[PDB]
Design a protein around this nucleic acid. Sequence first.
RNA 1: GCGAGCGUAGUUCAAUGGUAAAACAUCUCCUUGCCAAGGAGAAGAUACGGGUUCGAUUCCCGCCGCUCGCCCC
Length: 983
Amino acid sequence: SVLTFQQAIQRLQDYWASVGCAVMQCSNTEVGAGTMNPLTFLRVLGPEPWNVAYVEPSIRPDDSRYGDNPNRLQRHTQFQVILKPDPGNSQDLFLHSLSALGINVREHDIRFVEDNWESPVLGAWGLGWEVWMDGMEITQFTYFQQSGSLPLLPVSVEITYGLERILMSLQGVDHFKNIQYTKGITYGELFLENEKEMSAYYLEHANVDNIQKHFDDFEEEARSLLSLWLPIPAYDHVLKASHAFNILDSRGFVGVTERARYFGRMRSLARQCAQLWVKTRENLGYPLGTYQEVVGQPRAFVLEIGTEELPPHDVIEATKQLEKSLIQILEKRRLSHGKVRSYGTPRRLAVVVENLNMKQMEEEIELRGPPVAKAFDQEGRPTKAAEGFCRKNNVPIDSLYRRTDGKTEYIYARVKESARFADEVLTEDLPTIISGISFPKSMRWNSNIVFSRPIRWIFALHGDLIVPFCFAGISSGNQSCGLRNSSLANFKVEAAELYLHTLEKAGILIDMQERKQRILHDSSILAEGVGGDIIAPDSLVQEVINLVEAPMPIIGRYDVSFLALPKDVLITVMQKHQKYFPVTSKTMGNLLPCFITVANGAIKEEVVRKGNEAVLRARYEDAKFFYKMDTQKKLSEFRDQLSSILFHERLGTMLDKMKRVENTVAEVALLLGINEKMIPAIKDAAALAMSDLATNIVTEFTSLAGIMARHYALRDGLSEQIAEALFEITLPRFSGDVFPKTDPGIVLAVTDRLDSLVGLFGAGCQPSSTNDPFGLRRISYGLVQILVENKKNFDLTKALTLVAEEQPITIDSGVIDEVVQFVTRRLEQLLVDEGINCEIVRSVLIERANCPYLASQTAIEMEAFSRTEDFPKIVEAYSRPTRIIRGKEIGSALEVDASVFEKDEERALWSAYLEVADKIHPGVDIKAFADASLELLQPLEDFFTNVFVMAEDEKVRNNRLALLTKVASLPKGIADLSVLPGF
RNA sequence: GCGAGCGUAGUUCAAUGGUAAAACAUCUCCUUGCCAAGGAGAAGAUACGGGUUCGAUUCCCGCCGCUCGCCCC
């Protein structure tokens, strides 16, 4: 038969009542979610056992949609299970319950996808997954780590069943009202009374006069009750205080600045209320309980650390951190290995080392004792150092010999190495090599050991005997588990040599790169059935590979009516949420009504497709509804209602930013030198620039921001010279993306970057090396890339002042210099990325930092010129005079003259300087620089050898100093010769 | 508050249970006199305290200050 709603509860309660949980009633006050119940938030704190499963309604006014959208409701029923402490069968009891509910496990793709839950409202976080069943997200699984502010001890396991969608996906209905509550009655005919009127109340009839005066009253009452050591009512009032904030948010009378205040007040109250329950319960003595705590031949060596599911971006790191650090320890312990190779899978990190000997290399080593002079006197017995050395290393005195090195030659002795049996070494060393792995995030399950996910078994084998060592309370043995619910639930490996053959007997494709050649070899074969090809982005396949133990591709179909949507919406929906493979025809290369998904294991073919297409054709209904509602009005009207998006608390929303950009675009369009004839269209592009951010299709599809504006503009009936400008206001979006290539778009891009930098530097928000409050480095790197990779002249210090003029607040002259220095420092980092020597760019950029393109075309050429074998000659000559200038500055008062000039050497040098100064101007490049400076070198030697520039007469000294300074000042405007390596 | 990483000439850097190395800068001098260019020498140091050992820049502990997460925000 078909499962009904009122007996799924009866099957989910009588099951958890047999494991040992104590079922209780629902909440009392309107809870905004399934966690804020006092039976879970206040009871996980403190060392007492707690096993509870219950069912509760959840009310969220923010998700009210008049009860028409088949996905979002204002009242959904959840099932909560809390286990503490975790008994080790955490994710096996869940599968047993799922089987007992009525659905089979052997014919449904049940997989875990990593998802980290975190809620700043009450201060909690943890690590866990969401359970996918044929593409439906039906269950949340989470190991807690922290509640309020206390650290959990011991950690707890939370299993949340979203019960309204399980039956909606199991029965086969498409709407939500079509769910049947019982045999005879339905869900949509008795639970819409508390839906429609509640939606109407939460949307446009909730009187806001009383809510904003009940919120503070409840906060004050909660504080007063908490001050009297009354925990339960104090926390009870917090729930009805936090409900008022949500109902205020639903109406829309909360600004973007009071949100932080409300969140801070609520979290402070929750933090100061949570740490009172622990202090209250400790005085009662914890009535519930308390928690505590002969030579052979080289044979193979296998190490496997069987854990639970790991994120797709941690297997790659761990399988390298293990093998790289393991191929080093055996070298430290003078072991002899063969071919070492590591394998990774979402449930294990194996390393196989072949031909590992059973013994160590017993060889003698020569030590290095004290100096011979110190340890041996001129006459008599050797001093105390020699005897100390002998008694330390247990060697005879005659064994000492003298070898000549350094000043004091040496004292040397020969000692053994104490060869062990090559098994005790591994026994004593493995607990360090295993624990040496580190991850960006970690957790604990039953001890104080840090790891990405819980470890469930360890299989460390060498030849025929087992290496005995215990890690995290697990003893290493000779058993390994394969596919769950399969016939080979757990198998025994008799010898480490016959290991990789056993796993492929269980169907597991352990090799990391082998799975790619079986995914992409079948996905292409399945395409030719309809005459097409797949789309395989690297960032998609790299993550699809590390989610499957034994891949199996299946194709599926959907209706053609969804082809009217934009091409970049279907691809985004397919590839960013469900991780499918789109299909494109070879001829007329648009989208096709097909998709390819990857199952996991041995599953029924028909059921997975029939249950997966019903999700793919359920997402597109929402997408099409949003698109149709979003194309009712043209793009012009959306520019007014963007004020709900804040830019900065001190600067404001996006409307002010757009007005500033459209005001200051004219000057920037003139600094870049773009012709006047194109100035009108630019002034119109900013009229609609960055207006897609308030649209409906972009509210939830963040990645589509920037292109949907172009699509709307094209549909509106505007010229093609403005849609490209609208689209290219966000490029580049990520590293490696394309750059703007149309002239009107460059102006908008650089104007936006400059305004965003100036505004955020006006409030003083300089990021550090680690934190990125706004990613200003990314913006600067985009700006310099746009300026350089497009060959456009610019003046940074002149444009920045103009940009800062229209800022709402006055900004001092130090911020512009700080921004210029920051951009210069980023330009240096960019220029040292293509192999340019650091000392060359470091010298060019201290003088050519104004126009980035000029600097990029000068520093890429001066390095190439520096290999002419004459570069050091010019470097030595030009600034040989410079080191004389520093010191006395009396000669700077006057300049040269032809009255007190001395013998013809200085006159010839001055004539040569006058000749060469004509070709050197600040607007010259370096092509003719050295070719013109070569003629000045010859008189310089004669001058410095035959003028005696020593200051004997004040007038001649001043004149000579001035002449020398003006000779040495020529490169002022081209490059500097201080950071020069030749110097 | 709570973890890690650290600390050697003025700067940059070598090594290991044992008489502390090298560049650069400074200085003293030899070339025809002042800078460049060839040579010789000089001085220059283990953040600080204790413990054990014949003997620790090295092993253990205390403190000083720096840098990074977390706390706060």
